[PDB]
Design a protein around this ligand. Structure first.
Ligand SMILES: NCCC(=O)NC[C@H]1O[C@@H](n2c(C#CCN(CC(=O)O)C[C@H]3O[C@@H](n4cnc5c(N)ncnc54)[C@H](O)[C@@H]3O)nc3c(N)ncnc32)[C@H](O)[C@@H]1O
Ligand SMILES: NCCC(=O)NC[C@H]1O[C@@H](n2c(C#CCN(CC(=O)O)C[C@H]3O[C@@H](n4cnc5c(N)ncnc54)[C@H](O)[C@@H]3O)nc3c(N)ncnc32)[C@H](O)[C@@H]1O
Ligand SMILES: NCCC(=O)NC[C@H]1O[C@@H](n2c(C#CCN(CC(=O)O)C[C@H]3O[C@@H](n4cnc5c(N)ncnc54)[C@H](O)[C@@H]3O)nc3c(N)ncnc32)[C@H](O)[C@@H]1O
Ligand SMILES: NCCC(=O)NC[C@H]1O[C@@H](n2c(C#CCN(CC(=O)O)C[C@H]3O[C@@H](n4cnc5c(N)ncnc54)[C@H](O)[C@@H]3O)nc3c(N)ncnc32)[C@H](O)[C@@H]1O
Lengths: 262, 262, 262, 262
């Protein structure tokens, strides 16, 4: 069917991309980077994230596949030596699709609104000065956070920034998001929960400014300074990312291979 | 309907129990501690845990209610001053039931099998010497754990031992269990994941002895030395605990009230 | 003797400053903010830090005193109601001096050199992109750090940023500095020590760029973007800050009062 | 001079011990395990700890040396292949001695007193039930600890149990001890400092029972149940352990080799 291939851009990934295109030419596969049905990413997890954001408006029509040209990427879970086997299996199709949950981030301003989708996480920091936000969960004031920032992670993002912040690793069949603290201050007058928090679908987490209304907001690799922010709202998206799966590579085995040994 | 009341046993809880029994006597309520349909616990969370384990073979026929005579208990979420209001609302019924997930623990021996249900968590430590187990997830060898022990928590247990071990706090609508480490050793030859792990329903986590086969296994307050252990298996139970709910007391508000301020 | 008084600048601190100046006028005390021998800070710890940096070139000629107008400040350990008692005791003198260690930070450039003194800590982050430095301890390559940044703390700084990063609290009679990580990445290819590190006098810790040579370097409240950095060197300073002490207020009691209860 | 050699007891360590004894026989060296001046430990860090405790009453007359027959031991920092080189250098002498600080533990009872010396750490846990102690620092009540236990570490012990508990790694030229928590409970009624605490010489840390007076107290590998405990006192010992050093192996390089890569 229609497919496209993105490359990290080094000589090794470009050559693998050219060889796969040549192999696809031997099948009823059409290269189309406007309306692909398969998106192949050749590089690392950064490359895969750029592919996801390149096509985040057609997520329900696309199955993604990652090939890692360096060491094992968490989303890019094919080795370059297996590219021909992958061309052949994709060409026939009949593969099964697997879906991971996504995070929806809404940024409200004063006197419109922007929404973003994250595959790993969205974070919030101040624009230079102290970072202070009120954390409101389902319209209930939960805590006033003082510290470096906050991180809201998807399940597949839990092995990324979330992990370095002390968060739990969560299986991606769980439709949830996870909020972790960056260096909270805690004394007898300033108090946060400390622990990571895991939220189900339909729970809304709202960050509201206390003094400064300018924030540095990241969504995956993208980081933008937002001014005149009234609110930042987090919820599990209704949208999901779909992967083409051709063999068993369980999440916990992927975790083992990335952090324990391989 | 049929009900019973357990008390922590101090003078204050016994008197509240006697007064509630007297108030129930003014309604079509029969005291029956063999086949209750309502189980009221007066005391603390320890009292509530004993009530749950007293009736864990009739969980689907029972709705639980906790009254906290000390500071706020996480399961015991009525104040003693509200006991009369609670008698009246229970008597009429028409309340809604809320369900929390439970943890199933299976202990296998050599040359039978024991199962246990946990509302907070189950933990494993050695019987005195070094603690070393292989952690197997869905039949996949994940890590060899060396350290003080391991803790497997339910969602409502995540605010208990799990929290002190660095675990995430998880909303109890999520059907999951969470595994946390106790003082793992990590150097260039011994390696664990470090991070808490969150598992969905139908995932099985198996601990298998490496040298010593004797372990101290806790389930909630109960702690027993098990000998000749071949395997300890954790999974989300199919069984659930049901609470009688008469007003909104959201989980995240309960978390706020217990750890932030009240 | 010669003295000066700095104020946080709100109405309450300015009035206390004016009243102390009036009280000092009744003694052989001369107001001199060029060559003071006593520097009184009225405000919070931020105010005290600005006072220290205002006079960091005459530290050996100055004894510092802090008055906290809000809740207890860690350096500002007199209440406003005790200001008159403090005027009287300072006027007579015969007080004892207590000394805390300081941190020296050297920043080297390519094709000069800048040094800074810190009372709380110095931190390093990237100028926007990924943060990667090689950590060299006494000319020995120790680790390649990948993450958000690094924090080097004095002993009295250990209750500040260092504490939020998981660092140990160290008694200020110990002449040491403490290095803590901010969100290090650790997988099977990236590896850091994780643990805070505590260094004695005469040990030198050097951070050396790997790719990007631009860094955001903080020293206490001051944060500056440094370009073309070749090296950042940390060592315990030979210089010390001196406090005027009039009564026993032990460090561990100050810790208790700030974080446990008061 | 007078020397002795302890072995872990496996075939490999016994053979190395016999060969070193044979090599020492070619010099003016006398085997004496009553009053040695050199104590050689062949095995692992457990073997080295047993050697230290075998001779803890003659620490000022003894220099210790460790040979690691498995992977690098932190105290046992010679490889077996270097044993002959070590025999020759010891025989001539003229080596330099290096000293590490030790921890003194005093256990007081009701109606005598026991003291112990630790090279790694001393820990305290309950005898089965809840662990609750009051932590008193230089006669000042600091906190009431509720949790699994407490760990007091020497500097060279900071890479051992202390590290797994989140403690800082401290250079052994610093005369200090470090207190770390094991799974403290923290809510709005129970409160501990959380952070590791680092104490200088002459500071005394006293643990005092609240309800139960029975405790499991470890000193290095030894663990004893103590009954009728009135107090447990920790301070940096006046005694030190002395190592024979023949070449530079800096502490931070030893840390790198054990935890980063080798
Ligand atoms: N400079 C520090 C950041 C860094 O080196 N990131 C790349 C590494 O992270 C791995 N990775 C990614 C990825 C990626 C691409 N990243 C770079 C780009 O796109 O340019 C952006 C992501 O960076 C993460 N991140 C940022 N700061 C971090 C920090 N302090 N600690 C840990 N992660 C941090 C955020 O989560 C962000 O989404 N996703 C996952 C995943 N879901 N599971 C496990 N591994 C994963 C990837 O294989 C590399 O090994
Ligand atoms: N001695 C230390 C343990 C202790 O003081 N426990 C009682 C306190 O914990 C609170 N609590 C309980 C409870 C209870 C009754 N417990 C006593 C009994 O039954 O005798 C047994 C439970 O103890 C926990 N536990 C054991 N060791 C712990 C440690 N090191 N750190 C933290 N928790 C620890 C385990 O999880 C066990 O299930 N369940 C929850 C909950 N789901 N959410 C939030 N708070 C909760 C309760 O209101 C008290 O404030
Ligand atoms: N916006 C977050 C930062 C913040 O609120 N800081 C002020 C609070 O911290 C207390 N404080 C200070 C102080 C101060 C003045 N600070 C403000 C100014 O000068 O404008 C600059 C300092 O900020 C610290 N800091 C920065 N980011 C932090 C973070 N994420 N977590 C914790 N601390 C953080 C750094 O260490 C810096 O030196 N020194 C100590 C001390 N030695 N012992 C115990 N308490 C202390 C002070 O009483 C306030 O309660
Ligand atoms: N079963 C868990 C404990 C364990 O495997 N211990 C041996 C390993 O630890 C290394 N080690 C030792 C040692 C030793 C001998 N140990 C065994 C014996 O004597 O039988 C007793 C010691 O055990 C430590 N320990 C106890 N529980 C622990 C836990 N949960 N996490 C981490 N350490 C733990 C305590 O501190 C105790 O003193 N001293 C140091 C040191 N100063 N620097 C760095 N590495 C060091 C040694 O090379 C092995 O790699």
């Amino acid at each position: 069917m229609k497919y496209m291939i993105t490359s990290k851009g080094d000589e090794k990934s470009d050559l693998l991309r050219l060889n796969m295109i040549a192999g696809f030419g031997e099948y009823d596969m059409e290269y189309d980077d406007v309306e692909p049905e398969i998106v192949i990413s050749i590089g690392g997890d950064g490359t895969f994230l750029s592919a996801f954001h390149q096509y985040e408006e057609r997520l329900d029509e696309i199955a993604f596949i990652g090939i890692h040209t360096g060491h094992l990427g968490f989303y890019a879970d094919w080795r370059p030596a297996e590219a021909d086997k992958l061309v052949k299996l994709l060409a026939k199709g009949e593969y099964q699709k697997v879906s991971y949950p996504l995070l929806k981030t809404t940024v409200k301003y004063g006197i419109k609104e922007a929404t973003y989708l994250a595959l790993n996480e969205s974070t919030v920091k101040s624009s230079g000065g102290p970072f202070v936000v009120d954390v409101v969960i389902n319209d209930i004031h939960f805590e006033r956070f003082r510290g470096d920032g906050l991180c809201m992670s998807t399940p597949s993002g839990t092995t990324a920034y979330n992990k370095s912040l002390g968060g739990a690793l969560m299986h991606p069949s769980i439709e949830a998001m996870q909020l972790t603290e960056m260096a909270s201050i805690n004394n007898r007058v300033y108090r946060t929960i400390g622990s990571p928090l895991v939220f189900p679908k339909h729970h809304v987490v709202s960050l509201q400014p206390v003094n400064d209304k300018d924030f540095q907001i990241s969504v995956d690799h993208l980081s933008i300074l937002h001014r005149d922010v009234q609110e930042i709202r987090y919820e599990v998206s209704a949208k999901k990312i779909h992967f083409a799966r051709f063999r068993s590579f369980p999440f916990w085995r992927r975790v083992h291979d990335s952090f324990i040994e391989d």
